[PDB]
Design a protein around this ligand. Structure first.
Ligand SMILES: [Mg+2]
Ligand SMILES: [Mg+2]
Ligand SMILES: [Mg+2]
Ligand SMILES: [Mg+2]
Ligand SMILES: [Mg+2]
Ligand SMILES: [Mg+2]
Ligand SMILES: [Mg+2]
Ligand SMILES: [Mg+2]
Ligand SMILES: [Mg+2]
Ligand SMILES: [Mg+2]
Ligand SMILES: [Zn+2]
Lengths: 116, 57, 83, 178
RNA sequence: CUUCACACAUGCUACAAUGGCCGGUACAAAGGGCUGCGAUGCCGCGAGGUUAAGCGAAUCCUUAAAAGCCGGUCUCAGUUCGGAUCGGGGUCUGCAACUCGACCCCGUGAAGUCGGAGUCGCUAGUAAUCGCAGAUCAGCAACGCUGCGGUGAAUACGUUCC
């Protein structure tokens, strides 16, 4: 029972299980289930082949998921980098890009302490 | 050497979600094998910054 | 100005300094201080000497810098790795 | 009575003859053998390939593979001569035809983010090689009964004399290139 | 004035089941409002947009308090915990939102599984925890400050030691 990835964690309800798709969160999962017809309170174990085929087509009909979405994100980042903008410069330097504070924080953009 | 070395290898049946059905002989799976995608349904077998600015404005 | 009811924002002195040249030729560097002006799909091929606080930097609007600001290509601060 | 074999013998043999002006039917290329190996690395470490490779290559192919042992010693890999490092099987005959069919038809498309095998991975004589990364698309194995994942690479040896001839043969057989 | 190999200090959010999410439902005080508050209705998933009743106000708006109670689900997992970072698309204020604003939506889902030596506050409507309001203010304060209420403990033998 695979959509693109495995997406069949052992004994998960369908709305939560769908979030394991890279590109679907809770809201996307809720509208997927509402659109197809499968109820949220239903385990991924008890999913039929026809239910799977219904919810399969509808994700590439509308949404964007593993692979192409991951390509588009890095495409945007790379475009910013070689266009020569301020955000791209900060992407190259490995610094926060949305105007954060770098005096005492930014420990996610930077790694752990380097202890000069 | 073929006494008790190779696994079972007997006629099976492949059925796909689209409906493309054929049959060969596979391993341990006893009879029919049900698949979701095949070579007859999978894609790749079946086939502007200024634009965005103007469609925004 | 950053809301889809008023369109983009360019300074009038910058617009009337580019639209009375692009109609005939790709004018050379336009010395300007208007970092806050967004690049419209008419600055293509032009070049601007944008102020950075101490001097003017030439920037060539090619194709993809059509939604950003003139200032984004004129860095103001200088940092070069304490050590 | 492998359907890929009869489709070959029925259309591919004379399609290739129409393409390349073979004056003798003995010159028509064909696939002679298909070789699959795992190429394990945990030889010095944990010494387990008896099931990591043997007990699943059996499932993918249908015959027990052979265990390969290092020919010399390398210190940078902790490799000592004579210990099991690779597991290889040689498919040939109708089993090879059936494996090629079962691959191209239902296994190869199942690869996640599959966009088409490269057509430039020929050897220069007509022999094609490509690799995988896991106990996926082969439905024969179950992820519920596997240890750590591991890939393989497959060699498709042909009687073709040139890369273009081999590529034409594989395209006719049903290998999706791009 | 917002820099950033680092260091310190004060805080907020967490590391979950005395919990998270969903549905229904009860109970405050103290304040603000004409360059203002916008009830109602219509549009929008939402931030919001438009019309516009009333109101210099114990009469209008602010005004839905939240923890709480009932039911359902999740079943101990780096998770339906956590919400940083980043991608896309927007709203509003403002001549102007790149440097350098807040907020909304979709996606992304990091460290973190209770914290070394050490160190801080508190003796009762207190500590702990939950919301609300104001000043500054075009916007930025639901992490600061000054206040307001809700729920509501455990201990004190004693003066040897600091
Ligand atoms: Mg300061
Ligand atoms: Mg959560
Ligand atoms: Mg609730
Ligand atoms: Mg509505
Ligand atoms: Mg989570
Ligand atoms: Mg960790
Ligand atoms: Mg835990
Ligand atoms: Mg301690
Ligand atoms: Mg204010
Ligand atoms: Mg704070
Ligand atoms: Zn199919």
């Amino acid at each position: 029972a695979r959509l693109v990835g495995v997406d069949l964690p052992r004994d998960k309800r369908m709305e939560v299980a769908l979030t394991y798709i890279f590109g679907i969160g809770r809201t996307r999962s809720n509208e997927i289930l509402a659109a197809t017809g499968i109820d949220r309170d239903l385990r991924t174990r008890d999913l039929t082949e026809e239910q799977l085929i219904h919810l399969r087509d509808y994700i590439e009909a509308n949404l964007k998921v593993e692979g192409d979405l991951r390509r588009e994100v890095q495409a945007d980042i790379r475009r910013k980098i070689e266009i020569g903008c301020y955000q791209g410069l900060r992407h190259r330097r490995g610094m926060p890009v949305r105007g954060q504070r770098t005096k005492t924080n930014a420990r996610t953009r930077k790694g752990p302490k380097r202890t000069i | 050497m073929k006494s008790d070395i190779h696994p079972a290898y007997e006629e099976t049946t492949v059925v796909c979600g689209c409906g493309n059905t054929f049959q060969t002989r596979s391993t341990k799976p006893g009879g029919r094998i049900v698949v979701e995608v095949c070579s007859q349904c999978h894609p790749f077998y079946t086939g502007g910054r200024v634009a965005r600015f103007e469609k925004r404005y | 100005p950053r809301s889809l009811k008023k369109g983009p924002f360019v300074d009038e002195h910058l617009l009337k300094k580019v639209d009375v040249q692009n109609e005939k030729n790709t004018k050379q560097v336009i010395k300007t201080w208007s970092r806050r002006s967004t690049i419209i799909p008419d600055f293509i091929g032009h070049t601007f000497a944008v102020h950075d606080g101490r001097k003017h930097v030439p920037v060539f609007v090619t194709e993809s810098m059509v939604g950003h600001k003139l200032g984004e290509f004129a860095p103001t601060r200088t940092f070069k790795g304490h050590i | 009575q492998p359907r890929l074999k009869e489709r070959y013998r029925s259309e591919i043999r004379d399609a290739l003859r129409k393409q390349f002006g073979y004056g003798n039917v003995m010159q028509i290329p064909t696939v002679t053998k298909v070789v699959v190996n795992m190429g394990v690395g945990e030889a010095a470490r944990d010494a387990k390939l008896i099931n990591g490779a043997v007990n699943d290559l059996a499932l993918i192919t249908g015959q027990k593979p052979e265990v390969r042992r290092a020919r010399k010693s390398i210190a940078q890999f902790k490799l000592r001569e004579g210990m099991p490092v690779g597991v290889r099987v040689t498919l040939r005959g109708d089993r090879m035809w059936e494996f090629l069919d079962r691959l191209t038809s239902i296994a190869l498309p199942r690869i996640r983010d599959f966009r088409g095998l490269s057509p430039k991975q020929f050897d220069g004589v007509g022999n094609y090689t490509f690799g995988l990364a896991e106990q996926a698309v082969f439905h024969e194995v179950d992820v519920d009964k596997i240890d750590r994942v591991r890939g393989m690479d497959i060699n498709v040896v042909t009687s073709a004399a040139t890369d273009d001839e081999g590529r034409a043969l594989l395209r006719a057989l049903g290998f999706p290139f791009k």
